[PDB]
């Protein structure tokens, strides 16, 4: 089924828990694996390109029309 | 009054307790906006600034921590002051949890 969505809540929850603002760059991309984003990045290993790509989609997402 | 330093020692303390608790969950140490009030669609005037604002990742010191928290600030999403080791951690899981929610609607 498809509360995979509820595996990537704890798994995301729980690496929250754990990470403080020295661990930016990593935090960013596991959440990265976690969402399923990491694949669609040109630039998998740079921290900068994973999180531009999920706001440009939140982006596009909360847009009218 | 106490030093930030011993500040965030107390949160740490508090904290402890709950994360380890329940590992499966995350409890903000500030209040969050709801997600589902994130997900209102652009007011047309922001929309429309929107489409002009280049994502600037590039920008020499926009480092990792300047572009997180701009990223939050369009988005409505607040970096509060505490934890003043962890706000920024808190705010960037908001913005994941927006992200989940969202491409679970799209998948139907």
Same mark, same amino acid.
């Given at each position: 089924?498809? %509360?995979?969505?509820?595996? $990537?809540?704890?798994r995301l929850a729980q690496? &929250?828990? =754990?990470?403080? !603002?020295?661990?930016? %760059?990593?935090?960013?991309? $596991?959440?990265?694996?976690?969402?399923?984003? &990491?694949? =669609?990045?040109? !630039?998998?290993?740079?921290?900068?390109?994973?999180?531009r790509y999920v706001l440009?989609?939140?982006?596009?997402? =909360?847009?009218? !029309? | 009054?106490?030093?930030?330093?011993?500040?965030?020692?107390?949160?740490?303390?508090?904290?402890?307790?709950?994360?380890?608790?329940?590992?499966?969950?995350?409890?903000?140490?500030?209040?969050?906006?709801?997600?589902?009030?994130?997900?209102?669609?652009?007011?047309?005037?922001?929309?429309?600034?929107?489409?002009?604002?280049?994502?600037?990742?590039?920008?020499?010191?926009?480092n990792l921590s300047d572009?997180?928290?701009?990223?939050?600030?369009?988005?409505?999403?607040?970096?509060?002051?505490?934890?003043?080791?962890?706000?920024?951690?808190?705010?960037?899981?908001?913005?994941?949890?927006?992200?989940?929610?969202?491409?679970?609607?799209?998948?139907?």
């Open positions: 089924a498809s %509360d995979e969505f509820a595996s $990537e809540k704890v690496l &929250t828990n =754990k990470c403080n !603002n020295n661990d930016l %760059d990593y935090y960013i991309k $596991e959440s990265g694996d976690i969402l399923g984003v &990491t694949d =669609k990045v040109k !630039n998998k290993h740079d921290a900068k390109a994973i999180l440009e989609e939140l982006i596009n997402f =909360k847009k009218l !029309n | 009054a106490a030093s930030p330093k011993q500040i965030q020692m107390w949160i740490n303390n508090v904290a402890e307790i709950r994360k380890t608790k329940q590992p499966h969950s995350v409890s903000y140490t500030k209040p969050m906006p709801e997600i589902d009030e994130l997900m209102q669609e652009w007011p047309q005037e922001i929309e429309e600034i929107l489409q002009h604002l280049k994502i600037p990742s590039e920008e020499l010191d926009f572009f997180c928290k701009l990223a939050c600030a369009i988005l409505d999403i607040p970096v509060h002051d505490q934890p003043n080791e962890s706000n920024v951690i808190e705010s960037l899981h908001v913005l994941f949890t927006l992200y989940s929610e969202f491409k679970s609607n799209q998948h139907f």
